[PDB]
């Protein structure tokens, strides 16, 4: 499993669209995860994070929430399948979520991967999973 | 509103219970709320985290949750009232959470307040908060 942070590139004062990807999913599916990025206030205001197609829960803001902590410098995702029989397990390789933010300054916007929480497929096994980097602008 | 982290005291290879409280809820209650809690690895291990009695929902685990990241120094709890109508918003005072800890050191385990995200009653409107530093053998 590998989840690689989009690259995209926008001008001061507009709003663009970053996208995490998701590839590698096993068959059981991905039952639950979490993760947190980092980010810098300064270059990127984030505006808000929507979760992306691969969210089979037909309600997507039951199974996936998130955290913006500006002073902290950090977003927090958090993926829990909430039919709780598997149902809604994550089973095909897409775009996991969508960043919104508005560029305030045209120095480089770095979007890292920080740390990992849980990861496992349907049979609550742990899974191996590789970060890749993106942002704004890099 | 105030949260206060309780100061609890524990010798080094037993497991204690840091509880959280919450005081001054308004009548309204509380729908939702998310924040930071900073803790030193290297004195606590955080074994897990239950939510108090004042989680009203029946199946508590649906509107309340908490990411540990241990490398980050970071635990992260996010309540966000299940029902959707307000049902389950916290009214009352009393226990919001219990950090279950083993001490590995009898070096002063601080458990630190971080930073807030939102925390707003059932009208969504934001609250003033005001939070109480603890932990263990402080």
Known sequence: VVV????????????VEIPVYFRGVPSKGI???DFVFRYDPN?????GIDPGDIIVDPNP???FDTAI???RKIIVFLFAEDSGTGAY???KDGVFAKIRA????????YITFD???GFADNDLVEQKVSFIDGGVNV
């Not at 270059?43 to 505006?47: D, G, M, P, S, T």
């Open 69 to 71: 902590y500006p002073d």
């Open 31 to 33: 039952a639950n995860c």
């Open 115 to 117: 740390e990992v929480g």
């Open 61 to 63: 803001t039951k199974s």
């Open 43 to 47: 270059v990127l205001e984030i505006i």
């Open 4 to 15: 690689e942070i989009g690259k995209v590139t926008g001008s001061v004062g507009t709003t």
């Open 102 to 109: 508005t560029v305030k300054s045209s120095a480089p916007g």
């Open 89 to 91: 397990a994550i089973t």
